[model samples]
Each structure stands twice: as C-alpha cells, then as structure tokens.
Target: AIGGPFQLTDQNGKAVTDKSLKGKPTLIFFGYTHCPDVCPTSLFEISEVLRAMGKDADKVNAIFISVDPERDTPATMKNYLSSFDPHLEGLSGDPAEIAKVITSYRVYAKKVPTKDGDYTMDHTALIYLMDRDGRFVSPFNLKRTPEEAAADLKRYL
Candidate 1:
C-alpha cells in the first residue's frame, strides 16, 4: 500500500494526483459525506485540532477521500468540507478511479442498500498519516480524540 499512484479530484474539481501531494505531510481519511456519524464527527474533530494547533495547520495537510463518489461529487465534497473548515481538502473521483485509490489504501468500502433505491457506503474508518516524502508514517486510531491525534501530528511535524 505504499507509493501507489492515485489520481483524484480536489474539492474545486481540479485534478490532484499523487505527484501533487509530494513534499507535504498528508493526513488522509476515507469517509462519505452522507455518513450518519463518523464522517462529520471526524471532520469536526479535525477542524478543532487545526484550530487548536494554530500555525501548525500550514505544516500538515488534511484530506478527506469520499468513498461514496456517486453522491459526493466535487461540488458536494467542497460543500461538505466547507461545513467544517476551508482548510481541509475533500477529494473524489469517478467510481473506478475512486476504487483504485481505495484499493491502494487497502480500504474496505461497499454500498449498503436502504428501503428506497438509495444506498449508503459502509467503509473502513482510518486516518492515514504520511510523511513529507509521501511514505506511510503512521495511522491514528479512529477512537482517538482530535487533540490526541493533533499532538501526534505535531511530533511528526
């Protein structure tokens, strides 16, 4: 799962590739905008962490990769991220591209049916921290508070 190439779209509908991510420490998470709990909670916690860290925000990049690309379009991703903070980047791509990236990250995601034709994605909850060189550095437990995760991020910085 290391150094695999990925091509995703940023919140702005601009192409963002693995090459664009080099030279920055990135914290990437797999979540969907429609998530009932974890996605919003995690984003909010990250917002708090960024606020608490002050200037540290410039040193670390946070990215949310939507597992439910069918619903979370680039505009949707932008709006979803805007709810928490403008600093966080939200990403999505075509289903196949998204699947490729998810597979590269070893994330497990699938569509769960509901009463209607609508469905939700059930995905693995993970926060991956990569070093400036785009190498896997570590990962934070899903249950860890943002403060704790931020502290770890500070140490990495």
Candidate 2:
C-alpha cells in the first residue's frame, strides 16, 4: 500500500523509474540538500549500511529523492551525492513531477521562508524499503547497527 510507480530523472540526467528498481531491493529517502541535520545523518547511516553489506552492496539500489526541486538541479544533486556512498543515486524532476512522486509516496514537504527570502523545506523523514519485485516492504528502521541493517536488507534478496 505504501509503494507506487514513479518516473524521475537521476543526478546524471538519466531517466529512472520504478521499473528500473525491479529485481533489486531498493532503499528510498526523501530530503533536500539544504537540510541541516537529518538528511545528511540518514544518508551517512545508509552509506554505512551499504558498506556493511560489502560485496553484496551492488545487489541493491539506494535512492535519494529531492523534496526541494527548485534549488536541487541535476548538477547540484550530483555534487551533493558525491560526499556520500557511490551507490546512492539522487533524483529530481520538474516541480509538478516532484509533486506527483511525493504525493504517490505520501511524503509531506512544505517550504518555510527565512528572513532573507530564502527557504527551507520541512519534510517527512522516513526510509522506504522495497523488495526486489518493487513492492513496498515497510519503513526501514535505521537506528540499528549498520551490520544489522545490512543483514535485514539481505533478507529481501
């Protein structure tokens, strides 16, 4: 009930869709690059989980879907992702397209304006885990040790 199909552009400007995730366990997170804390921490934790997976890491797909499409262009997505695990892919699309994806995923994101007219996004922080068949498994619990997380992910494979 939590998963649905999506077609978005990856950091490299490649088209990525739910169909592409078929046959691989996928981890998905929704956050913006300008996020001060939670986003980076989650991405780092995901990186550690993939690292713990070792050779099996290649068997899965980890995706970061941007909630702030206005400021998160493909280039910015690519640069921001460079600091994280190589297997993690960043996806962003047109504003309307992003809204559709977020709606489908039931992710809430609202922009909060700052004193200088700049804005920050307040969004849901949850990792979605999908099985190899592209079906929603559940919200991934990242609080566990990376090894434990890796083991849990391997169970789907």
Candidate 3:
C-alpha cells in the first residue's frame, strides 16, 4: 500500500507506470539532479550493485524518480542518467503527478531557496525495494557490499 497509480515519463520518453514495473522486482529512489551530493552518491552506489549483478542486472528494475520535476524533464533526466549504469531508468512527471506519487510513498520533499534566487529540494533519501507487482517490500539496505546487495536482490527473483 505504500504506492499506487502513477504515469511517469522515463529517460527514453517512454511511459512508465506502476504497471510497467510488472515481472521484475524494482529498486526505486527519489531525488533531484541538482542535489548537492546524496543523490549522485546514492545513484553511484546503486550502479555498483547493478554492476555486481552483471548479467542478472537486466532481470531487475532500477528506477530513479525526480522529486524536482520543475527542471527535470525527460531530456534532462536522460542526460543525468548517462553517467550512471545504462540499466537505470530516470523518471520525471508533471508537478501534480509527482505530488501524487510523493503522497503515495509518504516521501517528504521541500523546495529550499538557495543563492541568487535559485532553489534546491530536500527530500527523503531512501531507496525502496518493491516486488514484481510493485508492492512495497522494505526500505532497502545499501550498507553492505555490492555483491551482498546483489545477492539479496536475487532472492526476490
């Protein structure tokens, strides 16, 4: 029940919904491209796990959803994702759609004003592991080695 309906556009500009996650367990994270540190770090850590998974990586879904939709268009997301693993999918949606998903996941995100009238988002920095059907499983653990994480993910499949 942690998540419900959503229609988001992926890095490839393809539709990705709750239903699009069918048939594979997924690892999802919420963050913004402009996040000073945590977002990129977490994404790299996730890429490590995906690398450890190797061939099996394709069997799993790794999703990155932007909490800052105002500037994270599909093109922006795709470009940002290029530095990470190719298997990762970056999603962006309209502000209202993003709000709906945020509510569904109980994620906290706030826009904080920064220098020169710019702004940044402070959001929940948690990773979600959801089953093939897109049901919540747990707040995923990434403290372990990438191999260890990859092995644990395999258990779900």
Top candidate, metric lDDT: 3
Ranking by lDDT: 3, 2, 1
Comparing candidate 1 with candidate 2, which one achieves the higher TM-score?
2
Model 1 lDDT-worst window of ten: 140-149
Which runs in model 3 stand beyond 4 Å of their true positions?
none
- Model 3: per-residue Cα lDDT over 1-157, one tens digit each: 8988999999988999889898999999999999989999999999999999999999999999999999999999999999999999999999999999999988999999989978999899999999988889999999999999999999988
- What's model 3's TM-score? 0.98
Candidate 1 shows a clash count of 0
TM-score of every model?
A: 0.91, 0.97, 0.98
Pairs that clash in candidate 3: none
Count of steric clashes across candidates, in order: 0, 0, 0
Tens-digit per-residue lDDT, 1-157, candidate 1: 5546888899998898887777778888889988999889878877877776678887888889898988999999887787786679888899999888887888899899997888878898877888888888777654666677678778867
Full-model lDDT for every candidate: 0.82, 0.93, 0.95
